[PDB]
């Protein structure tokens, strides 16, 4: 009842661990790029769900999600075996903290991600309002594998009704690979050398963080020392965070 029952439209194994699927989207399901919803399946007549960031942008006809097999838990195992035509549960109330409006006006946007933290940014980098209010966007990730990069490359060019975004992304979006190390890279300044960019300041730099608990603790502490403040609905700031879904 708190879920709608979507139909799986396409399934993809980009590597042995990385799996994506697209499915039908409820007619009431509005969201902002970056948000998540509950995703799962009816198992033993009970809904079995977990939070997944919506990968697709809000102007795409279908939804998209992806999954990384790590521990191969009950849900991940069953999701990885979805077939086109299969029923899937999609929560009706999307939500999340990666909210651009909770960032004060600025020049540069950093999207700092590890593992599945990449997922909500596959959606945000296709949000046109990002490029209307920022000069530059940097996305840092931990993808290294052939098939993982092929997936990001596919996302990058999937722009239904927004083909003019192709030139804008090419101009403004910079991908920057790290290692399962970004904290260190901010600490040594090497992040800001590789890309010739000034180190974090509350004057120009706005940040989004999606990654592991440890990554968020260590990296926020580094942003604090540069004098950046966390944003909130009631009070926009310099950074926002969300724990990566695993």
With tokens 């963080």, the residue in question is 209
DSSP 204: T
Work out the number of other CB atoms within 10 angstroms of the CB of residue 53: 28
Q: How was this structure determined?
A: X-ray
* CA 31 from centroid of its chain's CA atoms: 14
How far apart are the C-alpha atoms of 116 and 121, rounded to whole Å?
A: 10
Distance separating alpha carbons of residues 106 and 5, to the nearest angstrom: 40
> Which tokens belong to 17?
């661990």
> How far is it, in rounded angstroms, from Cα 180 to Cα 176?
13
Residue pair 90/29 in contact by the 8 Å Cβ criterion: yes
Q: Which is nearest to 209 in space by CA: 76, 102, 51?
A: 102
In this structure, what are the phi and psi dihedrals at residue 71, rounded to the nearest 5 degrees?
Answer: -90, -15
> Residue 136, Cα to own-chain centre: how many angstroms?
17
Contact 139, 111 (CB under 8 A): yes
CATH architecture designation of domain 96-246:
3-Layer(aba) Sandwich (3.40)
Confirm or deny that 76 is annotated as ligand binding: yes
CA-based Rg of the chain, rounded to a whole angstrom? 18
Quote the strand ranges of the chain, DSSP E: 3-13, 18-23, 36-43, 46-53, 63-68, 87-91, 108-113, 136-141, 173-177, 205-211, 239-243
Find out whether 66 is annotated in a ligand binding site.
Answer: yes
- 156 with 118: CB under 8 angstroms? no
CATH of 1-95, one of 3.40.50.300, 2.40.30.10, 3.20.20.210, 3.10.310.70: 2.40.30.10
Is 50 part of any known ligand binding site? yes
Residue 56 · residue 22 · CB < 8 Å? yes
**75 belongs to an annotated ligand binding site:** yes
The structure was resolved to a resolution in Å of 2.3
Decide if 214 contacts 117 (C-beta within 8 A). Answer: no
Question: Is residue 238 within 8 Å of 231, Cβ to Cβ?
Answer: yes
Q: How far apart are CA 222 and CA 41, in angstroms?
A: 40
Helix (H, G, I), strand (E, B) or coil at 222: helix
Domain boundaries, the chain: 1-95, 96-246
- Ramachandran category for residue 161: left, alpha or beta (phi over 0 → left; psi -120 to 50 → alpha): left
Residues 6 or more apart whose Cβ sits within 8 Å of residue 169: 125, 131, 156
Q: Is 68 annotated as a binding residue?
A: yes
49, 75 Cβ separation under 8 angstroms:
yes
């Amino acid at each position: 009842s708190k879920f709608d029952t979507a139909t799986v439209l396409s399934v993809h194994h980009w590597t042995d661990t990385l799996f994506s699927f697209t499915c039908t989207r409820d007619q009431a399901l509005r969201f902002n790029n970056g948000e998540f919803t509950m995703v799962g399946l009816e198992v033993d007549g009970k809904p079995l769900t977990r939070a997944y960031s919506i990968v697709s942008p809000n102007y795409e006809e279908h939804l998209e999600f992806f999954s990384i097999k790590v521990q191969n838990g009950p849900l991940t195992s069953r999701l990885q075996h979805l077939k086109v035509g299969d029923p899937v549960l999609i929560g009706k109330k999307p939500t999340g903290t990666l909210v651009a409006d909770n960032l004060l006006p600025g020049k540069t946007l950093w999207m700092l991600s590890t593992g599945t933290g990449l997922a909500p940014f596959m959606s945000i980098i296709r949000d046109p309002d990002i490029y209307e209010r920022f000069d530059k966007v940097v996305l840092t990730h931990t993808c290294r594998l052939k098939g993982e990069l092929a997936y990001m490359d596919y996302i990058k060019h999937d722009l239904p009704g927004h083909e003019y975004l192709g030139d804008v992304i090419r101009e403004k979006l910079v991908y920057y690979p790290t290692v399962t190390r970004i904290t260190d890279l901010i600490a040594s300044g090497k992040l800001f050398t590789d890309l010739d960019m000034p180190p974090f300041s509350p004057e120009q730099d706005r940040v989004m963080l999606c990654g592991s608990t440890a990554m968020l603790k260590d990296t926020t502490e580094l942003l604090k020392k540069a004098g950046l403040v966390e944003g909130k609905n009631s009070a926009p700031g310099h950074y926002v965070i969300e724990r990566a879904f695993v």
